[PDB]
Structure 1
Amino acid sequence: EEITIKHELGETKVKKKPEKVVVFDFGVLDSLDKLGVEVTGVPKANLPSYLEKYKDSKYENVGGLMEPDFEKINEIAPDLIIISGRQANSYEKFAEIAPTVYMGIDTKNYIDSFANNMKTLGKIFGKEKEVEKELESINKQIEAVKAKAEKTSGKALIVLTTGGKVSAYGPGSRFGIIHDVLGIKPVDANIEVSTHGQSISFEYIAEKNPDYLFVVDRDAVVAGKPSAKQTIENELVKKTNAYKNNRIIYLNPNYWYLAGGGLISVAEMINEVEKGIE
């Protein structure tokens, strides 16, 4: 009962409704959760807060996002492994074990890549209609939030913080969904697209002078110690418009940094943006 999945790192033969599924992308995991697909293995060490249910002992622990337990994955003998960018370089190692499908977000085409990802899950697991229905809800959600976005001028800047350090994201970056999809005008639409982004300090923020500053506290999740407010709210930033109108929006990093590209995380992500401009 096979299908063949063409993805960014190859073509994979997969049995439909595969019995034992190992997942290394949290967008995918949150997608399968939404669709009521049972997974077998997850990297429990990096599980986002909203996916804490996958710590349960009924799930196998296949290590961490960056440190797969390849011996264990072998012991499990899965019918399907699903990976994303973080594990792109280990594709071969996973493919040697079991059918490995790679799933990424093309950040020039966030929504299209997102939709194809979900539809592919729809095919593997027989959830085409379910997936469609959820994609349509996120379509509506997007429309509503665009309408509000276009009922104001106001320019957003999106930043990330690791321990003091600060960096910048714009159209077609990992966080560019704010601009590219949700109708928020950028402060700067020429930022370097890396996926840890152009580095900046506090003089760039002040002079660009954003009305909304969206922040993602990396060290909250990755170090286990939240540190973003301490860093961002200081003299050098405190008299931008954003600070004043109380429009520094601290985006939940468990969706924005750890996960995303999933039914739940994308829906949830769009929600934090809506409220941040309500």
Structure 2
Amino acid sequence: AMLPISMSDEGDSFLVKDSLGENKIPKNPSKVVILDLGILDTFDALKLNDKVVGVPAKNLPKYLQQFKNKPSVGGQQVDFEAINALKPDLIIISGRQSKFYDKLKEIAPTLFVGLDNANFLSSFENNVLSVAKLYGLEKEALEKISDIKNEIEKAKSIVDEDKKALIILTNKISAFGPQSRFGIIHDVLGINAVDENITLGKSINSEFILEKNPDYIFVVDRNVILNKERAQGILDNALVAKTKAAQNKKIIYLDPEYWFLASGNGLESLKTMILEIKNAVK
């Protein structure tokens, strides 16, 4: 279980500990470089847009275009020269940039907002509240956290207890299960898994899919972020056509700009993901 972010108020700053280390973070930071797309969406939802001085622009998804003219700090690829030239007072990162921590932390205090795949909602709430604490915005962040909790309960209430889903990432097809990077389908929304026994996932084929006969298949097509080959075609075969999922038109292509980029730290992006699952299975 990932160590949470903890903060103690030391006047004009916080002493902050997270799973990667300790930082002294000034209150109300005014020059923030954000490399996690989810928390960037949370900055927006808390009205902190003007605090942001740098974002991964090569990346930037359709739902974060209010940031497209921020100075770019990379996309996988971090530009440390650009980050240094901004002279930030805070850098914010998530799991994909933990490999860059020591170098980012030479430039400025670096806050990790990791999403624990075994404890998604507690990590999401801690990440959002910790950001908000920096700005004195706890009351606004609690309201919005509540709204997400209410959307989760609405989605959960309509789930068919007797139906099972398979999650896949796509020529390679790989299966994911509970407590994976896509785990919230099973772990938060309570949609049963075809295999509860499954960060790279398990290699599979159309035969595996037919074998399992899922009522739903949730597809995350990583081609879209990169190709001419797409999931609709990898799955366009007579084996996959045999499934309950194909028969009832419940092969559900999820937007990878949410699911693969992993924008679960976002107050509004997480909502959109919940609604996306709910509207597929109701």
Taking structure 2 as the reference length, the TM-score comes to 0.92
CA deviation vs aligned residue, 1:26-66 (integer Å, no higher than 9, x gap): 0010111111112110010011121122112xx111112x2
Residue equivalent to 1:107: 117
1:145 and 2:155 aligned: yes
- Paired with 1:61 and 1:226, the residues of 2 have a C-alpha distance of 30
Task: Note the residue ranges of structure 2 that are not aligned, 5 or more in a row.
Answer: 1-11
What corresponds to 2:179 in structure 1?
Answer: 172
Cα deviation, residue 86, structure 1: 1.2
Higher helix fraction (1 or 2): 1
Question: For residues 124-148 of structure 1, what are the alpha-carbon distances to aligned partners after superposition, in whole Å with 9 as ceiling and x for unaligned?
Answer: 1221111111110111111111111
Structure 1 match to 2:4: none
Cα RMSD of the aligned pairs, angstroms, is 1.2
Contact 1:211 1:241 in 2 (8 A): yes
Measure, in 2, the Cα distance between the counterparts of 1:183 and 1:34.
27
Number of the residue aligned with 1:186? 193
Amino acid of the residue matched to residue 47 of structure 1? L
Give the one of 214, 218, 227 matched to 1:214: 218
What is the aligned partner in structure 1 of residue 250 from structure 2?
247
Shift of 1:263: 1.1
Q: Tell me if the contact between 1:3 and 1:14 (Cα under 8 Å) persists in the aligned partners.
A: yes
Partner AA of 2:118 in structure 1: K
* Identity value in percent: 51
Q: Does the C-alpha gap of structure 1 residues 214 and 55 become closer, same or farther in structure 2, counting only changes over 3 Å?
A: same
Unaligned runs of 5+ in 1: none
Match of 2:9 in 1: none
> Are residues 1:90 and 2:90 paired?
no
Aligned pair partner of 2:61 in 45, 48, 62:
48
Q: Show the counterpart of 1:18.
A: 29
CA displacement 1:1-34 (0-9 Å, x = unmatched): 1012211100111111101000000001011111
Contact 2:41 2:267 in 1 (8 A): yes
SS of structure 1 residue aligned to 2:272: helix
Deviation at 1:238, TM superposition (A): 1.2
Task: Output one character per residue of 1:251-275: Cα deviation in whole Å (capped at 9) or x when no partner.
Answer: 1111111132221221111011001
Query: Are residue 275 (structure 1) and residue 282 (structure 2) matched?
Result: no
> Is residue 69 from structure 1 mapped to residue 84 from structure 2 by the alignment?
no
Letter of the structure 2 residue corresponding to residue 268 of structure 1: T
Please tell me whether residue 228 in structure 1 is matched to residue 231 in structure 2: yes
Return the alpha-carbon distance in structure 1 between the equivalents of residues 221 and 65 of structure 2.
Answer: 19
Alpha-carbon contact 2:161-2:192 (below 8 Å) kept: no
Q: Which residue identity does 2:164 align to in structure 1?
A: K
Measured in 1, the distance between the counterparts of 2:41 and 2:101 equals 21
**Rounded Cα–Cα distance in structure 1 between residues aligned with 2:154 and 2:214:** 23
TM-score, normalised via structure 1 length: 0.93
Residue 223 of structure 2 aligns with an amino acid whose one-letter code is D
